[PDB]
Amino acid sequence: SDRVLQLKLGNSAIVTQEAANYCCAYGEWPNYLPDHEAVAIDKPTQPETATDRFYTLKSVKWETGSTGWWWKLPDALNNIGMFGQNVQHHYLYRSGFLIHVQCNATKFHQGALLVVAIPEHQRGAHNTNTSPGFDDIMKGEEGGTFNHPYVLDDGTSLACATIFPHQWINLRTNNSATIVLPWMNAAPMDFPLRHNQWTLAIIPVVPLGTRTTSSMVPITVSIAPMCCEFNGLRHAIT
Amino acid sequence: INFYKDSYAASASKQDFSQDPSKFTEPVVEGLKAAPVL
Amino acid sequence: INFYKDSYAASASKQDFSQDPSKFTEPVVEGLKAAPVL
Amino acid sequence: INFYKDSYAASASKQDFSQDPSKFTEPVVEGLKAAPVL
Amino acid sequence: GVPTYLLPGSGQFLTTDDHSSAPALPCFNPTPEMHIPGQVRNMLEVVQVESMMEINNTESAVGMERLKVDISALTDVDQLLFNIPLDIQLDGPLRNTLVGNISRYYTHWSGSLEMTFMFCGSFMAAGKLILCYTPPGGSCPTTRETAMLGTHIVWDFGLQSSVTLIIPWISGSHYRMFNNDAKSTNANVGYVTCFMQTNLIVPSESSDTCSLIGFIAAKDDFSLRLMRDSPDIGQLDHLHAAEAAYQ
Amino acid sequence: GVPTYLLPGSGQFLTTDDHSSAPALPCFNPTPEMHIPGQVRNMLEVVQVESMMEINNTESAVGMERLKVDISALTDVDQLLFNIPLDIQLDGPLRNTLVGNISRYYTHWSGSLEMTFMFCGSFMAAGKLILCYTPPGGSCPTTRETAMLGTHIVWDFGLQSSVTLIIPWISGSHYRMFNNDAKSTNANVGYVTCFMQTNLIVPSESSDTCSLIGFIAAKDDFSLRLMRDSPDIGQLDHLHAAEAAYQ
Amino acid sequence: GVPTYLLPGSGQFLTTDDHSSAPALPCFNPTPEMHIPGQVRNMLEVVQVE
Amino acid sequence: GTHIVWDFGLQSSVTLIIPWISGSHYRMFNNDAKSTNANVGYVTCFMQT
Amino acid sequence: IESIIKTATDTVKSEINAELGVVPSLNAVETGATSNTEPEEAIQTRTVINQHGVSETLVENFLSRAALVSKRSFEYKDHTSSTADKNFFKWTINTRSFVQLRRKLELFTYLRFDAEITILTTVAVNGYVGLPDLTLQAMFVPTGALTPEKQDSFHWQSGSNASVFFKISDPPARITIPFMCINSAYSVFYDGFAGFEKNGLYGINPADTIGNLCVRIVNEHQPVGFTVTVRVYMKPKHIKAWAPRPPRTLPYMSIANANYKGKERAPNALSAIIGNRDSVKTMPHNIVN
Amino acid sequence: IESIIKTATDTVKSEINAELGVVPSLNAVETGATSNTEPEEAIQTRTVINQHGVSETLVENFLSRAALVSKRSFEYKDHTSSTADKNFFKWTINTRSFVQLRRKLELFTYLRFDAEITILTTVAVNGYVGLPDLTLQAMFVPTGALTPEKQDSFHWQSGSNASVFFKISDPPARITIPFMCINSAYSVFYDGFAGFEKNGLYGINPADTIGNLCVRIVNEHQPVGFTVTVRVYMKPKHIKAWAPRPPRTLPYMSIANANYKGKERAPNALSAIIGNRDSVKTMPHNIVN
Numbered sequence A: 001s002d003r004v005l006q007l008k009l010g011n012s013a014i015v016t017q018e019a020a021n022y023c024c025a026y027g028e029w030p031n032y033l034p035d036h037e038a039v040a041i042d043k044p045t046q047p048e049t050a051t052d053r054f055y056t057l058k059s060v061k062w063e064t065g066s067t068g069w070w071w072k073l074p075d076a077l078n079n080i081g082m083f084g085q086n087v088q089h090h091y092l093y094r095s096g097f098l099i100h101v102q103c104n105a106t107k108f109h110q111g112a113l114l115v116v117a118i119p120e121h122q123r124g125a126h127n128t129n130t131s132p133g134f135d136d137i138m139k140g141e142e143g144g145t146f147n148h149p150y151v152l153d154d155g156t157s158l159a160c161a162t163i164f165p166h167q168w169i170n171l172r173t174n175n176s177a178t179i180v181l182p183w184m185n186a187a188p189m190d191f192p193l194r195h196n197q198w199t200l201a202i203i204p205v206v207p208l209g210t211r212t213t214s215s216m217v218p219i220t221v222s223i224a225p226m227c228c229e230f231n232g233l234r235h236a237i238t
Numbered sequence B, C, D: 001i002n003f004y005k006d007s008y009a010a011s012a013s014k015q016d017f018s019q020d021p022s023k024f025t026e027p028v029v030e031g032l033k034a035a036p037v038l
Numbered sequence E, F: 001g002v003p004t005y006l007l008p009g010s011g012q013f014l015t016t017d018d019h020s021s022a023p024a025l026p027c028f029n030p031t032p033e034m035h036i037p038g039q040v041r042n043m044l045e046v047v048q049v050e051s052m053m054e055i056n057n058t059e060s061a062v063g064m065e066r067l068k069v070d071i072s073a074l075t076d077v078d079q080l081l082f083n084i085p086l087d088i089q090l091d092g093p094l095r096n097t098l099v100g101n102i103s104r105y106y107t108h109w110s111g112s113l114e115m116t117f118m119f120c121g122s123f124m125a126a127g128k129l130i131l132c133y134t135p136p137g138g139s140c141p142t143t144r145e146t147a148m149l150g151t152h153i154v155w156d157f158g159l160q161s162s163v164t165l166i167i168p169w170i171s172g173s174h175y176r177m178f179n180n181d182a183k184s185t186n187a188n189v190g191y192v193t194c195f196m197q198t199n200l201i202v203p204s205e206s207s208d209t210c211s212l213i214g215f216i217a218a219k220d221d222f223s224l225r226l227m228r229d230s231p232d233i234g235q236l237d238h239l240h241a242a243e244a245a246y247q
Numbered sequence G: 001g002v003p004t005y006l007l008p009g010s011g012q013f014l015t016t017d018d019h020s021s022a023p024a025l026p027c028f029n030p031t032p033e034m035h036i037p038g039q040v041r042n043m044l045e046v047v048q049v050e
Numbered sequence H: 001g002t003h004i005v006w007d008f009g010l011q012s013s014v015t016l017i018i019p020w021i022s023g024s025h026y027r028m029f030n031n032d033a034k035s036t037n038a039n040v041g042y043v044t045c046f047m048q049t
Numbered sequence I, J: 001i002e003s004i005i006k007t008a009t010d011t012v013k014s015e016i017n018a019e020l021g022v023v024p025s026l027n028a029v030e031t032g033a034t035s036n037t038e039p040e041e042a043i044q045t046r047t048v049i050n051q052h053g054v055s056e057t058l059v060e061n062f063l064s065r066a067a068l069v070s071k072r073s074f075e076y077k078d079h080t081s082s083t084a085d086k087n088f089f090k091w092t093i094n095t096r097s098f099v100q101l102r103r104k105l106e107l108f109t110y111l112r113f114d115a116e117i118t119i120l121t122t123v124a125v126n127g128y129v130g131l132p133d134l135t136l137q138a139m140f141v142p143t144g145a146l147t148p149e150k151q152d153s154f155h156w157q158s159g160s161n162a163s164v165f166f167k168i169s170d171p172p173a174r175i176t177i178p179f180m181c182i183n184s185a186y187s188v189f190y191d192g193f194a195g196f197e198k199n200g201l202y203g204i205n206p207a208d209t210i211g212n213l214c215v216r217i218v219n220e221h222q223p224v225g226f227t228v229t230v231r232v233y234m235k236p237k238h239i240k241a242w243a244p245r246p247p248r249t250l251p252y253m254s255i256a257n258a259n260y261k262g263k264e265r266a267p268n269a270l271s272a273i274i275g276n277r278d279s280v281k282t283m284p285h286n287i288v289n
């Protein structure tokens, strides 16, 4: 009963037959900005179903040497569909996200993915005094790969990452993970091109294994922005 | 003892015993029962 | 805390939130409407 | 005079005049009378 | 006696402290109060008064010439006339204004600004302008078709001499900082630009060149925070006759 | 005036004192509060979250390999698979955990711990394990028939991926100390051991070796006392760019 | 402020004084009390034992 | 566009609803397939995993 | 109309307008009124409940912080051969010598306040043996009273002048001076002459004369010389303020007048207060990516 | 569900179970929830009335103790020939330079607090004549204000900056700084760039900029040189905290970033955080009798 889930948002739907409940980060749900928390006084555009829909990113191959993958929000979506166009035309943005992570394999496969949403995942570089550059951080839709997932690329640890909102994909048990993220920021809105509220991370704590004939085992990421608001209409930065 | 005019001057507020650990231990949309989880 | 006998000894009086900016923004004998000014 | 928040900070408690010396002088299961003890 | 102990900060002179202190002249009677015109009680009353922008802050504009912008008839459509930098912290057209000079005693600011422009051509001069505010994030717009996408007022010259462009408070944070880093995301406000909407059209006996005066004020949603010494004044020496105060 | 005298401790700077002190910025208005997800108010909320044990803290396990234990099919009955040292003070599998890192800011602790193990073999892998807690007083048990006499859960693999062994708070004293003397009777907790109850049994097309991930958390009977500087961090030098903060 | 003056004996450490003093471990919770046999409250209870 | 992500499982079948999205009340069965009164658009299937 | 304002104003949501005869963005600057266009009239707004306080821009808070008004160094030594402040100095009280407080005070035409005075003293050995804990006397000498001529003159007996005696090892000495103008407010600016003849000072109101501050070391000189520096701070309090003024732009030249020269080039040159940009079309810090 | 918790929870007695369909020790870690197995479900328990308080793990108590944030030594001397902190220094305020406070603060993503500041000063004679009782001035210079260039520059007149003047023989100077972020909370971590161009700093939120602390000796130099050391302590108070984080394991490299290297070998090496034992079957401190 908590293994089958349908998510419907706008013109998009996802069904899964092997979920493991789903996470609402910190027990929150996305909502629009109330008047008692507003700063910017222009009337916001609320595009609803034009933006509040699943976008599916390029799938990555899970391979025996894989260190894990990450995608930054809103950056990974800033160039996609009508969400991206509103990002490019507006100074200010606010939304939640619905994250659905997909990975199926046979009953003869084994492997476990930690699927974790990290708020303000400020990265470190390895073995240098120089801070990470713009091109190290801003990957867009492709996302990045972990250099040292064991310290989360930030001198910290993977083992304690379960303090952040997460599920697991354990190929024995489930083929999908779902995390619902509220707006997570100190300011009520932000400029979407220079700050990321959330990093999705997928780390293979138990590596992919089988003795059947090998197949490509992709991991697929689908993300729906939720309750998108935009303020400060301008030309496109683009 | 606070004779200063600004309330941020005051001593520390060590009295908030409210907790909600379930926002970190149980952020599941459907709560666990005592009962096969899945 | 003021134990001095003269009231000019006291601490500062930071409580007067009365404003009337219109004596500087609108010293016009006939007030503006929301409406051609002239 | 104690303006500290923790009660262990306070001055000493010199007011407990309760005594029971019989737990040390008379721990006998049957009490002595005024009367051959044995 | 009372048992006491001294805390950290005992005996310090904090310049922003607020205590009573010993009256040097006992039984003194101050002069009775008299009503005087123009009492100010909050400095936000002062920044709500509009004052002239030094928009023409260019070499070869001398003195009063810096407070006006001259407009001429053009022969190409939709041309840019001028732009206005919106940094109050850096030395631009907004600094030497009432809102400007008072705000520079503070570090944080929030709320809307009004710009008003008065057309000072002849009665026979006609024309339409477009005044555009661009929220930050990209470069200042150089073409009317780009600037038109921001907040703008189209202004027709007529019997009423002046329009206001409201600059609405569009900000991610509650406040902005008067930051010497002008490109900081906590400080940059964006841009104001003026284009020809139609043209300045004048008859032969009117002057062919006409002037705008630009003004700015805060609205009453405006707020200032974190008081600081203003960078607009300083001294390297004693003033003249300062020594003579000791002689 | 008031007659007073100064006590011992007058003028000291105690770093754990709690007084009001002079506000440097009078009339300052802080930014309005906004609701943010995930407020923590007691650190006991954090240690109740389960986090991965570094059970495979062995040479030749590198990085993430240290967070999993590999299980294989055996040909002898009732074999020992692994054990877990329970000293939080000494550098063992429990140290780099949420319960571990927070507890090391404190000196005394009380209450129950939960260990959960997730089996990450294939769907076709089957097996039963026994997980045993031994209260302190003797050596760590090396045979299943000895370990079976302590607190234990027998775990069958199935559709539910995980079991918990509760480690109940069995102690003579109200608290234990994070004592560098691991053999101290005020500090030692005893042992966790895992044996094969039956065997790991897999078909030919499943991987012959399967992994456990182990987690630990505090229960809500858990309590911490006597705050201390954590031994998990230190510096011998200035950090880079620390000097540049003065330049 | 309050006008004050210091008396003789200000700043002395008298070993038999009785004042409150600053708690070095804020929010510390002492171990619950347990009943123990043989509480003594006055030393005159001890000298009455032969 | 409008899409369903389909996971294989115990339930064998998914439906994609093709909603009636049209400017006019009706479409024509027109031999001109590129006519704006007739064209419906497309269905496509991709690998999700 | 006067009202109590503790927080910045709320914004109401607004709709599309399109009304004939209603033009809230048009204004008439020639009347002298500032524009009354509201943001709700200029653009479509949302509702914003505004919680920002306005206490930090209160005139009381803006002015009532302590600022340096006098700084004087002198030799504490045997002065029998000197030409000099011979263990004491006299200061003719003014508030125009240090530009930070001066410029803030000169934002107003009339001010009524009491003055909190803090006196900070510091000592160094002349070119070491330790620093002595000296006693100083500050004596307020009003208009027409005799000032001390010597460190040991009998003027210092202070039968009716207010004196404060203070040590260097003390906290800074503090007194409040009442608002003591013979008018209801100090004249911060004075478009007039001090006397009935034509030769009196321009720009100083006689009504605002405070008097003299005379400061001596009370100790006899030591065998070795020290430099003593006295710093005086004033804090206005219980402040009323009238008729705000355009701020000072050019550097001050003098404590006695408003004379002006400007810097040699912009900013704050007489020909150009704002620094130059290349043209009215140049955006000086334009964002480029 | 939110509730008030002052003491640890009681234990109820439990009996034998043997119920079909009820398996409280089985769990599903893939959901992301932590195990809900109670001890009463796992073993037979007794009743325990639990009296242990939980006040010492309050975030207020955990964070609100004073920690060193700045330490600076400089020469108090005649500096006419020096290259140096010439009787004063400027500090760009940060909390990342001393690892004990840094690591505790970095257990959280967002923090809102007021800062109690304690300034401790100490002096030694340069390589003896006694120690001088100096006056120091600490001046808070916010963003965009001018910092002092010299010990005697007029910036120190402090017309509107907060200054505290304090002696070395005083108790340590103390002030509270209000929570002064332009947001509702400080960003302890910031996954973003400070500017609208691409060249701004990674990892610093511009919203959290405090400003500068400028500290001078107010005395003129003596004939002999001293070393003055200033120590600044911060204590957070009135604290709110959001989104707890995994703790720092590797040594910090820099105040400007989260860059990491690790120790050369375990513990806290990049390849191995926990120190090694011989095998998963080895009990390192096993009791043997």
Ligand SMILES: CC(C)Oc1ccc(C(=O)Nc2cccc3c(-c4cnn(CC(F)(F)F)c4)ccnc23)cc1
Pocket: E024, I069, I093, I094, I095, I105, I111, I115, I117, I138, I139, I140, I162, I163, I164, I175, I177, I186, I187, I188, I208, I210, I213, I232, I234
């Ligand atoms: C010796 C002790 C017992 O008595 C003392 C008495 C006085 C002082 C001292 O230094 N006082 C002062 C120093 C500087 C200025 C003033 C003003 C003032 C100047 N101008 N204004 C109007 C303005 F602002 F509009 F210009 C107000 C008024 C009263 N005192 C002042 C020190 C000590």
Ligand SMILES: CC(C)Oc1ccc(C(=O)Nc2cccc3c(-c4cnn(CC(F)(F)F)c4)ccnc23)cc1
Pocket: F024, J069, J093, J094, J095, J105, J111, J115, J117, J138, J139, J140, J162, J163, J164, J175, J177, J186, J187, J188, J208, J210, J213, J232, J234
């Ligand atoms: C001169 C006197 C009158 O004024 C003074 C003013 C200030 C000081 C001083 O040293 N202040 C401070 C030192 C170190 C850090 C801070 C922070 C802070 C940094 N970061 N954060 C967010 C965090 F924690 F999340 F990172 C908060 C905030 C305010 N002050 C600070 C000393 C004196």
